[PDB]
């Protein structure tokens, strides 16, 4: 698949002609219908990214980035991923907020980097690094290059109708920009864990970077998880530009992409989590990540869609049901969960809530519990409880009627009004006589006599033993 | 005895010859 996909893509993308979209936009039209390639003017940072092994000259920032890449490119993908993960962990608190920065960096180093690089390249990097005025270069990188501009709206022609072309071109362009940003940010952070850079002086930058890396990761994750959804939440983010945009030159396009960048680095997270819920697997990383009261409930409902969910929910305090539950605001929540999983989680939550609570609600809870227990004592408990809706109980016992009989026998043994009468009536509704007798322990005798009005001998006998006039009559009858 | 062979059939929706 990997190979055929690559080839099919390549084929589909065979170039055929040029179109000047807008005034100046270079567009290439491909052999396969619905396949076009836009060629986009690079920004400064993009030029640095796309020309590491070239740029003869370059500014200080470029040379700095080139040397950072010079070191980071010698590490392997697994190492780099494990480092990225750790940087997420600092934000998520999986690396506790209790630790000092130096301690988290030490953790990261020992677990991820130690023995995983050539000390020679470290020396090369340290040497090259000593030529730079780091605070200045980092200042220019973070506060100028990477962190985008405050807009007083700079004419991103508002689209009257959805423009699928500019939509996908925007999303792909954003993705390229943020991928590049991601790689830079990670390389710099890396340099912060490897060397003794005053964790106080650069405290601001470090936390900004860890903030930025994180956002980058998130976006890129969502991008490959569900592009359509990402686009939808990212364009319904901007109000005046809800439908999309038009751009007729490279400046307008760059400015729009930067604009979206701003959106990402700065109401978005909520709109997108909401739209999403209304990408299951990612939101785990991003409910461990992006969540770190509201975040708690989010973590709950997300982890439910089970132990973790229930635990978090209890500790703190489909869409329509959730709305109803929110309006009600424990009982409602458990009822809803039970209904949604209707299983272990459900049953457990329901039972717990019912216990914590102890006419409609009561009856429902009771019925549910009894059914769950008979599916997996409960009978007698519920009965004694309600006794201390009679027809309801009559129906419940109707369902009950062997296990029920055993339970009843147990209750009688333990004992040795309304409940008694209901039971007698249900029993009256061999087997019958026996059950009746067992429960009444006169009723027994009456029932036996009525049924009699081998079998004869057994009945007369049972009657005589229970009584121990009647005996004499029974004896005479048996003798006659 | 049944043997499915989706490979070579006769187009049920096209005339012959």
């Amino acid at each position: 698949l990997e190979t055929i996909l690559r080839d099919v893509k390549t084929a589909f993308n065979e170039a055929s002609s040029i179109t000047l979209y807008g005034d100046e936009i270079i567009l290439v039209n491909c052999f396969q219908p619905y396949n076009h390639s836009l060629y986009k003017l690079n920004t400064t940072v993009e030029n640095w990214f796309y020309n590491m092994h070239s740029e003869t000259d370059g500014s200080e920032l470029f040379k700095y980035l080139r040397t950072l890449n010079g070191f980071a490119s010698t590490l392997s993908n697994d190492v780099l991923r494990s480092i990225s993960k750790k940087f997420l962990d600092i934000i998520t608190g999986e690396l506790p907020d209790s630790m000092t920065t130096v301690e988290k960096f030490t953790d990261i180093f020992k677990n991820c980097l130690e023995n995983q690089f050539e000390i020679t390249n470290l020396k090369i990097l340290f040497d090259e690094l000593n030529s730079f005025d780091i605070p200045v270069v980092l200042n220019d990188l973070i506060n100028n290059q990477m962190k985008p501009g405050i807009f007083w709206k700079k004419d991103f022609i508002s689209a009257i109708k959805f423009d699928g072309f500019t939509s996908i071109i925007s999303l792909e362009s954003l993705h390229q920009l943020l991928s590049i940003h991601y790689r830079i940010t990670l390389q710099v952070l890396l340099t912060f864990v490897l060397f003794d850079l005053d964790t106080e002086i650069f405290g601001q930058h470090i936390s900004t970077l860890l903030d930025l890396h994180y956002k980058q990761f998130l976006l890129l994750n969502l991008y490959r998880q569900d592009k359509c959804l990402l686009a939808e939440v990212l364009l319904k983010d901007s109000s005046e530009f809800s439908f999309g945009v038009k751009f007729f030159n490279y400046g307008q396009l760059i400015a729009y992409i930067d604009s979206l960048n701003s959106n990402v680095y700065n109401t978005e997270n909520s709109f997108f989590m909401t739209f999403f819920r209304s990408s299951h697997k990612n939101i785990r990383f991003f409910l461990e990540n992006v969540e770190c009261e509201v975040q708690e409930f989010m973590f709950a409902m997300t982890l439910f869609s089970f132990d973790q969910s229930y635990e978090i929910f209890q500790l703190h305090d489909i869409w329509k049901d959730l709305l109803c539950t929110f309006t009600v605001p424990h009982s409602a929540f458990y009822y809803q969960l039970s209904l949604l999983f209707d299983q272990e989680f459900a049953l457990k939550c329901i039972s717990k809530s019912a216990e914590y609570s102890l006419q409609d609600f009561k009856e429902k809870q009771h019925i549910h519990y009894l059914n769950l227990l008979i599916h997996f004592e409960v009978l007698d408990v519920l009965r004694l409880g309600h006794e201390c809706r009679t027809n309801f109980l009559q129906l419940l016992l109707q369902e009950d009627i062997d296990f029920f009989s055993t339970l009843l026998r147990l209750c009688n043994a333990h004992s040795d009004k309304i409940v008694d009468s209901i039971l007698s009536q249900n029993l009256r509704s061999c087997f019958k006589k026996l059950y009746c007798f067992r429960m009444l322990n006169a009723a027994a005798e009456v029932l036996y006599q009525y049924i009699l009005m081998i079998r004869k001998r057994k009945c007369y006998l049972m009657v005589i033993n229970v009584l121990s006039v009647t005996l004499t009559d029974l004896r005479d009858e048996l003798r006659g | 005895k049944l043997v499915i062979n989706k490979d070579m059939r006769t187009d049920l929706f096209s005339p012959p010859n």
């Binding site: 697994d78 991923r81 993960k85 750790k86 940087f87 953790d107 | -």
Partner: protein
């Protein structure tokens, strides 16, 4: 193969031999939905086919699911009385150390809530650290989770010391280095592999993602399943992807520039590799879903050896310390199977 049933209402989640402690290496623990069960492996007369049978000793009730399980070196036997120390993970997202005398839990330590992991815990391991005088100075538990955190939990003479370290991605496995408790390895979901000195940046980070031989594309998502040390001095590191792709690096001499060897299992490895305790070059990996187990030799001696095929899913598995027996927990049982070649 001999098969030993687990109790009818016991769903297994994890299976591990007590290889970490020679006094107790015939002890097997099964973490399940209500606790941890201990079995003993004995040489019967049997036929010397499988000259090894399993005897169920007892069951430690905990009341909630056990997902990961590790014996410590502190385990001991007495006449009779077993003194156990177990690290495990529970349904409440806590990480626990339970110290018992047989089935009775005499002592329990729990690390959870916000002070604990802030998401799902993916892995745990334990090692005993001794001072220069050689009394028990510390017991050390390492754990990794989806909160992008690695936690080092040290239980010392003057009490607990807790430390958290941030990860660039969810932690999916962790294991202290053999013959050197000062070093350990942590695995990130994204393919990053950390070597760490917790006594102290952390020393080294490899990565399997960019190394995939690509002669056969390992696919878009090749999430790292497992990384484990191999050798008894921890002379090596082995990493395995969900895809079945595996890689081995050694740690001694001269300068190094790539992983020393690389390959791919016939099947995906959801549970990852379980390296042989005696033959470094060998490890086992399961196709847990169809219940097959491939045996792989790093220097290609192997030529696709699949000693084990069940007709059922495999939940977990592990080598007995002897190197010829395998214990395997399936959804309703544990099997002990002996491969005649390793005897």
């Amino acid at each position: 193969s001999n098969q030993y049933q687990l109790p009818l209402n016991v769903r297994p989640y994890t299976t591990t031999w007590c290889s970490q402690s020679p006094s107790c290496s015939n002890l097997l623990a099964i973490g399940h939905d209500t606790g941890i069960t201990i079995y003993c492996a004995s040489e019967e007369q049997t036929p010397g086919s499988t000259g090894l049978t399993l005897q169920e000793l007892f069951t430690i009730q905990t009341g909630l699911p056990t997902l990961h399980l590790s014996f410590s070196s502190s385990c001991s036997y007495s006449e009779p009385v077993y003194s156990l120390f177990l690290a495990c993970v529970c349904q409440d997202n806590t990480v626990r150390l339970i110290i018992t005398k047989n089935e009775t839990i005499i002592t329990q330590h729990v690390l959870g809530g916000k002070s604990g992991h802030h998401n799902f815990v993916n892995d745990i391991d334990i090692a005993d650290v001794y001072s220069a005088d050689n009394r028990l100075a510390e017991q050390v538990i390492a754990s990794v989770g989806d909160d992008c955190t690695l936690i080092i939990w040290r239980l010392t003479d003057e009490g607990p010391i807790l430390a958290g370290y941030p990860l660039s991605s969810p932690g999916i496995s962790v294991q202290f280095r053999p013959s050197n408790p000062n070093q350990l390895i942590v695995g990130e979901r994204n393919g990053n592999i950390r070597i760490f000195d917790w006594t102290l940046p952390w020393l080294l980070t490899l990565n399997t993602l960019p190394l995939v031989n690509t002669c056969h594309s390992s696919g878009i998502a090749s999430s790292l399943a497992n990384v484990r040390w191999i050798g008894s001095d921890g002379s090596g590191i082995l990493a395995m992807c969900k895809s079945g792709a595996w890689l081995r690096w050694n740690l001694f001499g001269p300068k190094n520039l790539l992983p020393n060897v690389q390959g791919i299992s016939l099947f995906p490895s959801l549970l990852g590799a379980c390296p042989h305790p005696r033959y470094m070059d060998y490890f086992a990996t399961a196709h847990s879903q169809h219940g097959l187990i491939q045996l792989i030799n790093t220097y290609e001696k192997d030529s696709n050896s699949i000693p084990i095929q069940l007709g059922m899913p495999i939940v977990d598995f592990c080598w007995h310390q002897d190197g010829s027996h395998l214990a395997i927990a399936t959804e309703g049982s544990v099997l002990l199977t002996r491969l005649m070649g390793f005897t």
